[PDB]
From a paper:
Protein fem‐1 homolog B (FEM1B) is a substrate recognition protein of the Cullin‐RING (CUL2) E3 ligase and plays a critical role in regulating proteins in the cell (Chen et al., 2021, 2024; Hughes et al., 2021; Kramer & Zhang, 2022; Manford et al., 2021; Raiff et al., 2025; Zhao et al., 2021). FEM1B plays a crucial role in balancing the reductive stress response in the cell by degrading key proteins involved in redox sensing and management (Manford et al., 2021). FEM1B binds multiple degron substrates with distinct recognition sequences, which suggests FEM1B has multiple recognition sites for substrate binding.
The X‐ray structures were determined for six additional molecules (VU0412674, VU0417412, VU0421763, VU0023775, VU0081201, and VU0432623) in complex with FEM1B. The six additional molecules which are classified as chemical shift pattern 3 sit in the same binding pocket. The other six fragments bound to the same site in the FEM1B substrate binding pocket, a region typically important for identifying C‐terminal prolines of degron substrates in a non‐covalent manner. VU0421763 (KD = 0.34 mM) does not sit in the same closed position, but Phe130 forms a hydrophobic interaction with the pyrazolo pyrimidine ring of the molecule, while Tyr84 sits in a flipped orientation compared to its position with VU0412674 or VU0417412 present.
Author numbering: 0 to 287, 290 to 337
């Protein structure tokens, strides 16, 4: 029933009171030490050890103490509340990368610490740091044999998450190193797709510099066509400017974008809806001629039919109501 002392040892580690930890651990047999330092504590919905919690909270001195003076295994795993969620299989190192405590990361890998050890979702400490964009920690792990190519349970790579979260700094580092831009995920998405849907313009230029392939989403959508739907005009124009997309791919990208400008109540701008929907119409009719098969007018979208000719489109250039409808219809055709 001596686990009462273990709760004081845990509390000392959690709070970073290194001298309190020191006092508690002295005067104790080796049998006692392994017990108190290896006690899995269920405080909260979690499960962790003194070393892990010190790491999770960036208590370097407490962490430096347990390693150099009590030879505590760094392979200890646990379950830890982070940004809302509770992550299972985390080591002191992984927790310290997610929480962004560089100096504790240094301590842990300096001693024995598997930089490639994965959580239950298969997240390396590198992925953690990549999610949060601490370039200092990302650089250090990579330089100590962290594997850039281990991806999570769903093939989400370190580069993909850095692109999604918009860590331009981290993205460029991974590309200069080992990182494969052309990797796909369980849903078909690549680093480019993510960095397109979220409109991280700088990152898209970086991925272009590294000859990343334009491939199709699990939805059959090129990163260009994903930026259209996410109504990311800047990104769409960028991809269109480097790429040599067949007139159809171009037209469908311009339409999907323009259409996305009328409904997207966050970036809603019906006059840009005209700019792109009209531009795609000219591209249709430059001739040698890409005509479009519209859908019959349903009550849901008034009872309008989608403009077939360029002349039909100019007829609503100033009727913001009919253009707001037109966007809903074009997109209804292309996606839904
Ligand atoms: C909030 C700081 C990072 S928490 C986190 N969540 C994840 N989900 N899938 C992988 C990972 C990872 O490496 N870290």
């Amino acid at each position: 029933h001596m686990e009462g002392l273990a709760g004081y040892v845990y509390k000392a580690a959690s709070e970073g009171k290194v001298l309190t930890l020191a006092a508690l651990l002295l005067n104790r047999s080796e049998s006692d030490i392994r017990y108190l330092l290896g006690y899995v504590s269920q405080q909260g919905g979690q499960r962790s050890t003194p070393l892990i919690i010190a790491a999770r909270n960036g208590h370097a001195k407490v962490v430096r103490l347990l390693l150099e003076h009590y030879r505590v295994q760094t392979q200890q795993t646990g379950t830890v509340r982070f940004d809302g969620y509770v992550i299972d299989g985390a080591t002191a190192l992984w927790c310290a990368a997610g929480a962004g405590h560089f100096e504790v990361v240094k301590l842990l890998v300096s001693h024995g610490a598997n930089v490639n050890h994965t959580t239950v979702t298969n997240s390396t400490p590198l992925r953690a740091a990549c999610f949060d964009g601490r370039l200092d920690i990302v650089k250090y792990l990579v330089e100590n044999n962290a594997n850039i190519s281990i991806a999570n349970k769903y093939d989400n790579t370190c580069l993909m998450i850095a692109a999604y979260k918009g860590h331009t700094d981290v993205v460029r580092y991974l590309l200069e190193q080992r990182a494969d831009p052309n990797a796909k995920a369980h849903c078909g998405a690549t680093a480019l797709h993510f960095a397109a849907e979220a409109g991280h313009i700088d990152i898209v230029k970086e991925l272009i510099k590294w000859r990343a392939a334009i491939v199709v989403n699990g939805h059959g959508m090129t990163p260009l066509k994903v930026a259209a739907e996410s109504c990311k005009a800047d990104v769409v124009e960028l991809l269109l400017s480097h790429a040599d997309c067949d007139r159809r791919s171009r037209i469908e990208a311009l339409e999907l974008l323009g259409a996305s400008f009328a409904n997207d109540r966050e970036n809603y701008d019906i006059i840009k809806t005209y700019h792109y929907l009209y531009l795609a119409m000219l591209e249709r009719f430059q001739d040698g001629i890409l005509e479009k098969e519209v859908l019959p007018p349903i009550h849901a979208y008034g009872n309008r039919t989608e403009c077939r000719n360029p002349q039909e489109l100019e007829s609503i250039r100033q009727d913001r109501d009919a253009l707001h409808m037109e966007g809903l219809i074009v997109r209804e055709r292309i996606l839904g």
